[PDB]
Amino acid sequence: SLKIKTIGDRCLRQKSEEVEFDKKEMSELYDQMCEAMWASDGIGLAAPQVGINKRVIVVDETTEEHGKYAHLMVNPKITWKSEEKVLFDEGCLSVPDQNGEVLRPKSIKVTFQNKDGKYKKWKLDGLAARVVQHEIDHLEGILFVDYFN
Numbered sequence: 001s002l003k004i005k006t007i008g009d010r011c012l013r014q015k016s017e018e019v020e021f022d023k024k025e026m027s028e029l030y031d032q033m034c035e036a037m038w039a040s041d042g043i044g045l046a047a048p049q050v051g052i053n054k055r056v057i058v059v060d061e062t063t064e065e066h067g068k069y070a071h072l073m074v075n076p077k078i079t080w081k082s083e084e085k086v087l088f089d090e091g092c093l094s095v096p097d098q099n100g101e102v103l104r105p106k107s108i109k110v111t112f113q114n115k116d117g118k119y120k121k122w123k124l125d126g127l128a129a130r131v132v133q134h135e136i137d138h139l140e141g142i143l144f145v146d147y148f149n
């Protein structure tokens with residue numbers, strides 16, 4: 001099963017590579033990433049956090065109505081960010097026992113390939129916009145603690 005790597009591991013600082021979508025590969029990776037995310041009470045996860053330096057993220061959207069669900073986003077790319085920013089207190093599964101208030105755009109538009117390999121573009125706000133930005137930072141070798149200096 002996947003093990004979440006923590007600060008000190010160079011895999012967290014190596015940028016991740018664009019993916020040629022392979023439906024069976026991604027289905028298995030999705031299953032394992034979701035398992036690792038939920039097992040540690042996370043609400044998003046990026047492939048480099050489990051030692052796989054490929055541009056793949058999962059984003060939780062669990063609800064009372066539908067139960068556990070997560071989005072797969074393959075090659076997520078931000079095409080637009082709101083001018084308005086918001087402060088939010090973040091923690092990271094790759095950075096034990098640290099937290100802090102991070103300023104990021106409130107809303108974004110993001111393209112990606114989904115679980116079925118379909119090309120999507122979504123406008124996101126609130127927590128979803130927040131999670132996606134945190135996860136794309138991982139794909140660029142950025143940890144949220146880098147924003148404090």
Ligand SMILES: CCCCC[C@H](CC(=O)NO)C(=O)N[C@H](C(=O)N1CCC[C@H]1CO)C(C)C
Binds near residue numbers: 134
């Ligand atoms: C908010 C932006 C980052 C969220 C993603 C992380 C997981 C992660 O490291 N992904 O790279 C998470 O679940 N972090 C949790 C987190 O920061 N929480 C979860 C609820 C909201 C927020 C606390 O303000 C902790 C408690 C595990």
Ligand SMILES: [Cl-]
Binds near residue numbers: 126128
């Ligand atoms: Cl929200």
Ligand SMILES: [Zn+2]
Binds near residue numbers: 094134
């Ligand atoms: Zn993180």
